[PDB]
Amino acid sequence: TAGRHGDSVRNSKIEISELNRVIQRLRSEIDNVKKQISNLQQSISDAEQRGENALKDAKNKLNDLEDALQQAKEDLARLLRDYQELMNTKLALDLEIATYRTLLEGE
Amino acid sequence: TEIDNNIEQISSYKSEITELRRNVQALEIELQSQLALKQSLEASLAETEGRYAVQLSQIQAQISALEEQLQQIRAETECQNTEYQQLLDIKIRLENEIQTYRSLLEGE
Numbered sequence: 001t002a003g004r005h006g007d008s009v010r011n012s013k014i015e016i017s018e019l020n021r022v023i024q025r026l027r028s029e030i031d032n033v034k035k036q037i038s039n040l041q042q043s044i045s046d047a048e049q050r051g052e053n054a055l056k057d058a059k060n061k062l063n064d065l066e067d068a069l070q071q072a073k074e075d076l077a078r079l080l081r082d083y084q085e086l087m088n089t090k091l092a093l094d095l096e097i098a099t100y101r102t103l104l105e106g107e
Numbered sequence: 108t109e110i111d112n113n114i115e116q117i118s119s120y121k122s123e124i125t126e127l128r129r130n131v132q133a134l135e136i137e138l139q140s141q142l143a144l145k146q147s148l149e150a151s152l153a154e155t156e157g158r159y160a161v162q163l164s165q166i167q168a169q170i171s172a173l174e175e176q177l178q179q180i181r182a183e184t185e186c187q188n189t190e191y192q193q194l195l196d197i198k199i200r201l202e203n204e205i206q207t208y209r210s211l212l213e214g215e
């Protein structure tokens with residue numbers, strides 16, 4: 001019967017067109033995801049080099065600070081031994097003074 | 108035989124439709140797999156970045172502590188410069204004064 005046959009051929013052809021457009025859509029989206037992936041890998045390597053540079057800079061900063069700390073300690077120690085010396089001297093002079101004072105006391 | 112040509116053509120369309128469907132399934136699966144990979148790479152990126160940020164944070168903590176102690180030591184050193192200077196003023200005063208008395212009694 002004519003109608004049924006025209007219908008079979010026609011709906012098959014149209015189903016084929018349909019399928020072919022969705023195949024194209026799918027392949028396009030797979031291409032998308034592959035490009036995203038590529039970008040992600042590049043971003044990983046980038047993040048690595050950035051992180052390493054940061055670590056290096058920070059380590060240099062810290063090293064400089066350790067050296068500065070040691071230096072400040074040495075400054076302080078020098079100052080403290082100088083102070084000890086000075087104090088010894090001053091105590092000698094204090095001795096003289098207190099002897100004369102005790103002299104005035106007995107009178 | 109014309110109609111027979113048409114019929115075998117219908118079996119042909121059947122065949123092609125089957126094949127295109129199988130292709131579509133394969134492509135859907137491939138899309139799944141690719142998306143999976145994308146997500147696991149998002150994970151790997153988060154790992155990388157987090158690890159580096161942590162190690163940086165440890166070091167930065169070291170810089171913070173060190174800067175802190177450095178500041179404390181320098182402050183102390185300034186206080187002790189002050190104390191020292193006061194002690195020196197006192198010393199020189201007593202010393203000069205004594206020596207004035209001495210030189211006077213020797214020289215008067």
Ligand SMILES: CCCCCCCCO[C@@H]1O[C@H](CO)[C@@H](O)[C@H](O)[C@H]1O
Nearest residue numbers: 070071072073074075076077078180
């Ligand atoms: C408040 C703390 C001050 C103490 C400072 C001690 C001196 C710094 O430390 C020491 O200095 C010596 C001579 O520079 C070196 O022989 C030592 O290697 C070092 O540990």
